[PDB]
Amino acid sequence: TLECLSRSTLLCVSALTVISYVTPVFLVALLPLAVVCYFIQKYFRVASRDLQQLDDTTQLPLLSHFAETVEGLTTIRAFRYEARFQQKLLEYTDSNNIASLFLTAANRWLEVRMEYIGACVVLIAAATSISNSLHRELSAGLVGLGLT
Amino acid sequence: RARFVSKKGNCNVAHKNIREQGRFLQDVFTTLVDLKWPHTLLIFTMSFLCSWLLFAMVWWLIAFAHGDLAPGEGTNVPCVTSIHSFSSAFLFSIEVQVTIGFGGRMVTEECPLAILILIVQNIVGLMINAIMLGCIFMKTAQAHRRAETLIFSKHAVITLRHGRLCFMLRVGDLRKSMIISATIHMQVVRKTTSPEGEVVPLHQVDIPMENGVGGNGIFLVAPLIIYHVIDSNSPLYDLAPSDLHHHQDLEIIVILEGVVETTGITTQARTSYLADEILWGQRFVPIVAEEDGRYSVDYSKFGNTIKVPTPLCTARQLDEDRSLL
Amino acid sequence: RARFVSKKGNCNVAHKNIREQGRFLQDVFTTLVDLKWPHTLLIFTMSFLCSWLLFAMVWWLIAFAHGDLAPGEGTNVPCVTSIHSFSSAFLFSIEVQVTIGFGGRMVTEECPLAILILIVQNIVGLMINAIMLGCIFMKTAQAHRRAETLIFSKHAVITLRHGRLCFMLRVGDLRKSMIISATIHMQVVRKTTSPEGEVVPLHQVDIPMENGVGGNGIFLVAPLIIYHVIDSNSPLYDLAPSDLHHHQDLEIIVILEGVVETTGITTQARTSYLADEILWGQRFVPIVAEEDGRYSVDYSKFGNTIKVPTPLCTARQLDEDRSLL
Amino acid sequence: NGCFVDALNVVPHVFLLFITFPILFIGWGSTWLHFPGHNLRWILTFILLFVLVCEIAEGILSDHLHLYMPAGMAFMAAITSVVYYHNIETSNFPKLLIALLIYWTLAFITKTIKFVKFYDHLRFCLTGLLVILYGMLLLVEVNVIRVRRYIFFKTPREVKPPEDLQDLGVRFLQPFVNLLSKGTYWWMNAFIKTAHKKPIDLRAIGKLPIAMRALTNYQRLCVAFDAQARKGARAIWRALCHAFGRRLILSSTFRILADLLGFAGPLCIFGIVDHLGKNAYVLAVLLFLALLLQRTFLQASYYVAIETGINLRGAIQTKIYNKIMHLSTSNLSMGEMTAGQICNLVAIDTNQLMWFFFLCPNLWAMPVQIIVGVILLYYILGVSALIGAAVIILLAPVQYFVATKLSQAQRSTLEHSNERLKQTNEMLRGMKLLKLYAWESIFCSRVEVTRRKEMTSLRAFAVYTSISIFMNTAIPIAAVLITFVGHVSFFKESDLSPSVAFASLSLFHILVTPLFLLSSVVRSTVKALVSVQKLSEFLSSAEIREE
Ligand SMILES: Nc1ncnc2c1ncn2[C@@H]1O[C@H](COP(=O)(O)OP(=O)(O)O)[C@@H](O)[C@H]1O
Ligand SMILES: Nc1ncnc2c1ncn2[C@@H]1O[C@H](COP(=O)(O)OP(=O)(O)O)[C@@H](O)[C@H]1O
């Protein structure tokens, strides 16, 4: 994970630097992208922290219950309370599942809006390219770098 | 057998030997409003087109009669300038009637007869426009759709509350809009024979709605079971539990009156319960439930019913047993 | 915990499992009136512009189709004289629709299709004008701003009057306009369990408004504390003073009904008081004061309250002590 | 009379846009009812959006306002049809549907007239597809009236909106929303906005849907397990793959479509560069649309994979908890049914099976991806394909051998860590007696020796992964260099226009990304294999004997 993160951040740096070099005008369209992305990341951060905390606080009691059922076997199978204990475990596992599901759903939502942000940036990067680097800049080699 | 007033609220009794001559065009002016929006739009466009065609015909006739319709240059001025055929005549009629006034065809100061036909055309048009506006506004003001939402459980039950036999029946609202000062007039009909040898074919008697210290009205927010307790003084106190299901003919009607908020009109809902409809010794399922942070009402259990181990006996014999126990 | 009806007067109970198909365009004709004056003006201009543009488009189309839009001299007469582009077509549409009739561009008696489009344009315009006038007048007639002024002190108190425990709660007017025949329906809700094993989730019961010989109504000029005395027959007579503050769930609602003067509609105000809202053993400060030559009412002391050395005990135990003293 | 037919087409869009505004403004001023063809309707509406973009492109190429207005009007007409269908999904009516049906019929008529007048004499295709799409939406509307109550006899016999996902008390609605929203998780908006206003709680978050409860997953899983038994470690694996089924397959199909579009992007780059060297803005718009579409479908695939994984976790958790009941204490006395061993089972197998079931749809698209990559790069390289082909064929077998040498270390790693955990368990529950007469050095040296063996396994794994990354970078760069040098001067004699160069670099990067990933995938793959072997040996413990 650490190495993939480093590779991806260096790729992002390279791409931003290349696009800035090919079209010195793009620095007028980068700050709104950064601002909107920053605000949405800030909004996602608190909800993500809350969902992770709730995930942990529901995941602990399920494993406590598992251990206690495993050790105190004879008593539970003596009372013949097995229906009650299975119902209890069903309750706990359903709560665990919903917590995990909401965490991953928030993850997916942030990813989707980030991909829309990336679509915006690549779109208007290519648009400013096809416009400026052809009409007024008249440069050929920079187009390939920019779009790639 | 025959019912007194139907479940939907409409009346069942059909009148015979009515007199004559009722509704001399005023109740027809209101029966017109009563008709459904499509039929009312149809009759409105019908009236308008009828008047338009009538006056178009008379204008074509007068232009033909003066000779101005005969195409000729000089020795005359047409009473209505630039009129050629029936089409332009109808165009002039719709131009002067609905008050658009194109002015391509001009009525002139040569013929006073055209002046008279115009001076009657305009006033009749204004009068028909005024009635057709007032009537559509009057029709618009009502709200029947808001009125027909009153709901009463299909069958009513009896139970034993506070050691006394009681009548339980559900009412309720179906929209956000409330109903102000809703009162209950609970009545019972029966073919009765007086001790003086007089037989009445149907006898309405008020059975009380048991509320607080007094009051004939209630307050409707959630489905509230109307709670009455039959006592030795009540007229319904004499019947038996095994004879009601099949043979007897007893109609218990409720009349819930109340004024709606937005319109301010006083509507009501009337419903009947027959001898074969009502049943014995049961209990409704609790509707309201403590939800997340509110009260949840489930209308699926509205007409649901559970068995209750309650004694089955007649109200007179039940009162005698209460005197004995 | 959950409340029955909110302080502002709106209802809190949320319905579930409602049926279907209610409000088949008539309740939408009234929900339109309900919307705020800005939204209603927006939708009115929207409807008008929609119809105008629709018929302008169809007129430009028909003038294009006949070939009269193709600029040519002779061999034809345009169905609408002097029509050149879409701009003049829209001008003709607004000239014939809203019935101004400039008459610079004249519809002729050569094309009956233009006659038909005009004869439908005018009737649809008249119908939409009639509905948009009736609806704005109907909306105008109401007065909600006059309705929402009812005020009830935030918390109600209990005191000892005439040797009996009593309920004191302030009401009042906020405008010069009076309210005719205002009646009080004072009710209490509670989750009750009958002796027959029946548990109700909420139980409305009428607690009387204690006035003269009779009467369910009052007269509102100045803030008048509604005066009720709980007795052994009252449903509220059984509670305790130390258990109401925190644990118990008792909602005491008041429903003040009455018809306003100028409009004649019957409005009402509903408010709730919880177990944690109501307090014990206090007295309101006298509002009215003998001014220079009138009576001055100070609304700053409306919700103010002073301590009173009154005994604190349950109403059942208080009645037992009254039997002992 | 071309302009005449253009106007005749403009008319019905205007009619619909004018009737939509009163109703839309009343509606703009909690039971979801769905109709058959809903998803088909939204799919067709997106196809309409695309074809309308193409029509606008044609209108730009030709220009004459009245000649390209029909596209700009059908655009708002389709968006307003979407608004109508949202207003009908939220509250059902028999009349709004007829209001749509009228417009569909009239638009079909106008398009037919256009087609005839064209036949008598690029436009043809765009127009033909338009007519076909209008016709299919018409058939959908006819199906809808055939179903419940457009005019049909008296009562709809209407469904009674679904209580499974509409039951009071539910917060999570993925299955209970509209076609277009599921991709974006628009429903989440409220929730994420709410969370900031008030902290989140378990009573805040809802319950689980009808089709999400662990009871039904356990039910399905046991039914499949029984069917498999009537026909061991392999059997339960077959049962798992069977049970998730169609959802898992769908996740794979979404990923494959996303992959084909992801390859499509670089082709648009090639076209843009070629026109820059010399039908270009269309390339930008189409490229933007393609990128957006790939992102949407990739995220949907990830979501459905996660769904399948969480359901797997729930089902196997409840299955092993039910089986713990019938387990006999004579197994509990043995090391195989150690309590610490069973809790390690639950926790780490939840983890490993969930991670493998998130990464399995990702690898069920690597083969199709690489195949399409090479079939695309042939048409771009030409006779210079041999070098890249030899490179990406020389990559595979050495990678297979490296992965084998990796898995062998990883399995022994797991065995050693599993014994270390039990040594720690028996070390911590007796720290009192341990510190009492100070036997610490012995147990600490034993755990240190176990840690050293585990570290040997880990260092073997790490050296092998380093060699893997070295290869996965060195072979690619050599490939690019060789191919380009070969084309320019070695044989081809056709000057590589920069478009070819950059498109090759793009496709090549797309090919490179999966290879780096598969090395990490093996780490979860052998772990899933080991976890299932352990789970099957745990299920094979001694039963309790019924009287
Ligand atoms: N869930 C509901 N929501 C609104 N109205 C209802 C509902 N169920 C029934 N109604 C109406 O109110 C009346 C209540 O009767 P009901 O309890 O349904 O007994 P039944 O099922 O035999 O008709 C019915 O006549 C029906 O028209
Ligand atoms: N001076 C006033 N004039 C008019 N209305 C008032 C005045 N004071 C309060 N009200 C309204 O009437 C109600 C009386 O409650 P109040 O006596 O003010 O207790 P509190 O101060 O705790 O709100 C309040 O809800 C308020 O909206």
Author numbering:
A (entry chain B): 1139 to 1286
B (entry chain C), C (entry chain A): 32 to 356
D (entry chain B): 24 to 52, 63 to 96, 103 to 160, 167 to 276, 283 to 329, 354 to 622
Q: Please, what does the article write about this entry?
A:
ATP-sensitive potassium channels (KATP) are ion channels that selectively allow potassium ions to permeate the cell. Specifically, they are inhibited by ATP and activated by Mg-ADP. Previous studies have established that the functional KATP channel is a hetero-octamer composed of four inward-rectifying potassium channel 6 (Kir6) subunits and four sulfonylurea receptor (SUR) regulatory subunits. KATP channels in pancreatic islets are composed of Kir6.2 channel subunits and SUR1 regulatory subunits.
The ADP binding mode at the inhibitory site of Kir6.2 is similar to that of ATP or ATPγS. This explains why ADP binds Kir6.2 with a lower affinity and the R50 mutation shifts the IC50 curve to a similar range of ADPβS on wild-type channels.
